[PDB]
Amino acid sequence: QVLRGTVTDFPGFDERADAETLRKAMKGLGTDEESILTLLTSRSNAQRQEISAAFKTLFGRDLLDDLKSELTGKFEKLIVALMKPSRLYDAYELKHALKGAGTNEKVLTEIIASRTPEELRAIKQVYEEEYGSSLEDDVVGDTSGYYQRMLVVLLQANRDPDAGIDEAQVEQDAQALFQAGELKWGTDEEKFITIFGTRSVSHLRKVFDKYMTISGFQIEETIDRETSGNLEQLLLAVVKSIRSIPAYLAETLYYAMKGAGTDDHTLIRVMVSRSEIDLFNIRKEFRKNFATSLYSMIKGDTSGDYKKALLLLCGE
Ligand SMILES: [Ca+2]
Ligand SMILES: [Ca+2]
């Protein structure tokens, strides 16, 4: 239960040297994809920011645009992602997943459901520092209904800290969920939102087992029978995140890679955002559930420099 990333500190790091290797590979005709991809995918995000800074004092060039110009396709979208400061990545995805005429509820749901209260607190702060408004305000602007109310509950980053399992409360919650869905003519979505969004992780795990005991349906089965659309997805993401975030994301990527069209935004976002958190566990949880290493579905749906990067980002 010690979650592991795949990208770690590069020993003998030299921001200026690393920076020269980039301008040297970036400068002149086209670009030298291998040197960039193999350089970045091996340097921790922190070192990537130090390099990106050395590059600017050295040449007076903003390293990033020197990449969002010499590059294009899906390799650019990836390296650009890798370059995004860890602290700003989620808030960035949310901002652009929110400056949509349409909306990738997948991004909001994915991020706001799998991130801890501590992470959510940081995300909210940086979002209001990088852009002009509150993350909550912008969310309430592109969403409506229960899908919005669940996201707003989550965004409060208030979830109870797990501190002891009270049986009576576990049965009351399991019983309340039961009475608000399966046994209700219609649905009481508000009871689901409150339970799933504020109770502690440990408590909720105890509630999901008891719910299966008293009803015969996994909470996910009931969620499928009782809810639909955006709310269904979020509710499913919260429960799966409560059970295991590594298993959840490991699941997310499969349905992006095994779809009616490969969603490259998810394969990239999930692997980049988790590259330093638990992308190793997302791999372990992959070889066990979906039955296939993350290493392979990469080596079987992508091409060019895009692959070698992803493969090096996963870690054999
Ligand atoms: Ca050039
Ligand atoms: Ca019902």
Q: Which two tokens stand for residue 29?
A: 């005709």
DSSP string, 169-206: HHHHHHHHHHHHTTTSSS--HHHHHHHHHHS-HHHHHH
End-to-end CA distance of the chain, in Å?
Answer: 21
DSSP 161: P
One fold for 12-84 and 85-158: yes
Name the class of domain 159-244: mainly alpha
Rg for the chain (alpha carbons), in Å?
21
- Which helix (H) or strand (E) segment is 29 a member of? none
Cα–Cα dist 184/188, whole Å: 8
Residues in the chain: 316
Which residue has tokens 């990545």? Answer: 89
Cα of 49 vs its chain's centroid, Å: 21
Cα of 139 vs its chain's centroid, Å: 17
Breaks (C-N over 2.5 A) in the chain follow: none
Burial 195-226 (b: 16+ CB within 10 A, else e): bbbebbbebbbbbbebbbeebebebbebbeeb
CA–centroid distance, 227 to ligand 2, in Å, is 9
CA–centroid distance, 226 to ligand 2, in Å, is 6
Which residue has tokens 């975030």? Answer: 245
Contact 44, 275 (CB under 8 A): no
CATH code for the domain defined by 85-158:
1.10.220.10
For 197, what's the count of Cα atoms within 13 Å in the CB-facing half-sphere? Answer: 25
Contact 232, 223 (CB under 8 A): yes
Which residue has tokens 């020993």? Answer: 11
Cα–Cα dist 162/277, whole Å: 21
Rounded to the nearest 5°, which phi and psi values hold at 29?
A: -55, 125
Cα–Cα dist 146/187, whole Å: 12
Cα–Cα dist 128/121, whole Å: 11
Question: Resolution, in Å, please?
Answer: 2.3
Contact 90, 115 (CB under 8 A): yes
Q: Helices 304-314 and 33-40 meet at what angle, rounded to 10?
A: 20
Cα–Cα dist 206/200, whole Å: 10
Cα of 250 vs its chain's centroid, Å: 10
CA–centroid distance, 313 to ligand 2, in Å, is 44
CA–centroid distance, 54 to ligand 1, in Å, is 20
Which sequence spans correspond to the domains of the chain?
12-84, 85-158, 159-244, 245-316
DSSP 160: P
For 138, what's the count of Cα atoms within 13 Å in the CB-facing half-sphere? Answer: 19
Q: Hey, how many other C-beta atoms are within 10 angstroms of the C-beta on 243? A: 16
CA–centroid distance, 233 to ligand 2, in Å, is 17
In whole angstroms, how far apart are CA 218 and each of 109, 178, 179, 221, 285? Answer: 21, 11, 15, 5, 20
Cα–Cα dist 314/207, whole Å: 34
Q: Hey, how many other C-beta atoms are within 10 angstroms of the C-beta on 6? A: 21
Nearest partner of 119 among 100, 150, 94, 82, judged by Cα: 94
Which residue has tokens 């579905």? Answer: 297
**210: which residues sit within 8 A by CB, 6+ positions away?**
170, 171, 174
CA–centroid distance, 46 to ligand 1, in Å, is 26
Superfamily of domain 245-316: Annexin (1.10.220.10)
Please name which ligand lies nearest the alpha carbon of 27. 1
In whole angstroms, how far apart are CA 168 and each of 16, 20, 203? Answer: 60, 63, 11
Cα–Cα dist 143/230, whole Å: 10
Cα–Cα dist 267/279, whole Å: 12
DSSP 162: P
Q: Is 157 left (phi over 0), alpha (psi -120 to 50) or beta?
A: left
Local structure of 67: helix, strand or coil: coil
Q: Which CATH architecture describes the domain 12-84?
A: Orthogonal Bundle (1.10)
Please name which ligand lies nearest the alpha carbon of 189. 2
Q: Which two tokens stand for residue 140?
A: 């309430």
